[PDB]
């Protein structure tokens, strides 16, 4: 996260760290057995770390659970990063408590201008911001028009832009797969962009609201 502030500890209880030796992507707990992340973060097996604030220090609130199934959206495309969403089933249910709580799936698509929170342990591009501690940032959803203007012909129905066209505040590598929460619901998954915090290049997020049927279906047949 670039240009944000350190999240208050456990203020984003749905935030998870996907670990394969080291943290490599974020994700969001949607229920006791399932985590939503970005399909480009795919690995056949991953360790989900919940209840984290500082990923390099034991705080006593962590729950480390290995995955049972990792399911990329059937139409994920590595050529253009389209339908960049994936589900991870936990091998054991997570224990919900003060440090671990799921985030609600969207009841509808958030309109342009809606203020959201994005968080993660990714590149901060700053000497003061310690990326080991969960970072937070408030970003507004941009209109499709603004999004297409920034990335002509690269925005599909499964993507939306959020952030500031003026730059300075944005998600970045390592935040990938993480949550974008607006009005208490998961509206986006950190997906891609050109650089981080560069003017004219806002972040691009997977549009969760159009995947509700795939998500709910998948979270019952598996
Ligand atoms: N600045 C958006 C972004 C997110 C994840 C990875 C690269 C870029
Ligand atoms: Ca920790």
From Swiss-Prot:
Residues 1-220 form the Peptidase S1 domain. GO terms for molecular function: metal ion binding; serine-type endopeptidase activity. It catalyses: Preferential cleavage: Arg-|-Xaa, Lys-|-Xaa. The keyword rRNA-binding does not apply. The keyword Secreted applies. It holds the Pfam family Trypsin. CDD domains: Tryp_SPc. Ca(2+) binds at residues 52, 54, 57, 62. GO terms for cellular component: extracellular space. Its EC number is 3.4.21.4. Disulfide bonds join 7-136, 25-41, 109-209, 116-182, 147-161, 172-196. It is found in: Secreted, Extracellular space. InterPro entries: Peptidase_S1_PA, Peptidase_S1_PA_chymotrypsin, Peptidase_S1A, Serine_Proteases_S1, Trypsin_dom, TRYPSIN_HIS, TRYPSIN_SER. Binds 1 Ca(2+) ion per subunit. Belongs to the peptidase S1 family. This is Trypsin-1. It comes from Salmo salar (Atlantic salmon).
């Amino acid at each position: 996260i670039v240009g944000g502030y350190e999240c208050k500890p456990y203020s984003q209880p749905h935030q998870v760290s996907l670990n394969s030796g080291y943290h490599f992507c974020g994700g969001s707990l949607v229920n006791e057995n399932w985590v939503v992340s970005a399909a480009h973060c795919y690995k056949s097996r991953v360790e989900v770390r919940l209840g984290e604030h500082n990923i390099k220090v034991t705080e006593g609130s962590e729950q480390f659970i290995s995955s049972s199934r990792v399911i990329r959206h059937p139409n994920y495309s590595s050529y253009n990063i389209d339908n960049d969403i994936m589900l991870i089933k936990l091998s054991k249910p997570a224990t919900l408590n003060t440090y671990v709580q799921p985030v609600a799936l969207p009841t509808s698509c958030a309109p342009a201008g809606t203020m959201c929170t994005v968080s993660g342990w990714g590149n901060t591009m700053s000497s003061t911001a310690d990326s080991n501690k969960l970072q937070c940032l408030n970003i507004p959803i941009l209109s499709y028009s603004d999004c297409n203007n920034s990335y002509p012909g690269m925005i599909t129905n499964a993507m939306f832009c959020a952030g500031y066209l003026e730059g300075g505040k944005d998600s970045c590598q390592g935040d990938s797969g993480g949550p974008v929460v607006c009005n208490g619901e998961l509206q986006g998954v950190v997906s891609w962009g050109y650089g981080c915090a560069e003017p004219g290049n806002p972040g691009v997020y997977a549009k969760v609201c159009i995947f509700n049927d795939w998500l709910t279906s998948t979270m019952a047949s598996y």
